Amino acid sequence: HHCLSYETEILTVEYGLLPIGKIVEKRIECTVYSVDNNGNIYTQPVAQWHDRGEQEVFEYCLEDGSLIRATKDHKFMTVDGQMLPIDEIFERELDLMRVDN
Amino acid sequence: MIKIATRKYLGKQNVYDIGVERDHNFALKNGFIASN
């Protein structure tokens, strides 16, 4: 398993941005925003919650000051719609998808 | 266009996942799209 730091903020319909740590520790029922392979944004419920125990965490800081704090193998979407480990996006100097909500 | 500038190790921490159906991804603050 690969996973995100407590403080990583997920956008919810009901509550706005909430740390994933709160969502999982309290098993908060909520609705998040997802993107399909054509770039359409839609909303859907959180279906499951998992505490993944203790793992190595890295902080990745973008040119715009934004931060991603996660396990290095956790996958994120690139501009061209691939799902790749954040550490690989860093090492290969790839472009993260950025949706404006 | 907006690269990851730096990587810093923060040690071992208690970490988390959520799961959704359909495309198995969700939006974060600042517009990133994370996998389940």
Instruction: Give the separation between CA A16 and CA A82, rounded to whole angstroms.
Output: 26
Q: How was this structure determined?
A: X-ray
Which chain A residues touch B14 with a CB distance below 8 Å? 6, 21, 51, 53-54
Which chain A residues touch B1 with a CB distance below 8 Å? 79, 95
Q: Is B29 helix (H, G, I), strand (E, B) or coil?
A: helix
Instruction: Give the separation between CA A43 and CA A35, rounded to whole angstroms.
Output: 9
Amino acid at A31: T
Task: For each of the domains in chain A, give its residue range(s) and CATH number, in order of start.
Answer: 1-101 (2.170.16.10)
Instruction: Give the separation between CA A29 and CA A45, rounded to whole angstroms.
Output: 8
CB contact under 8 A, A77 and B12: no
Kindly report the length of chain A. 101
CB contact under 8 A, A68 and B5: no
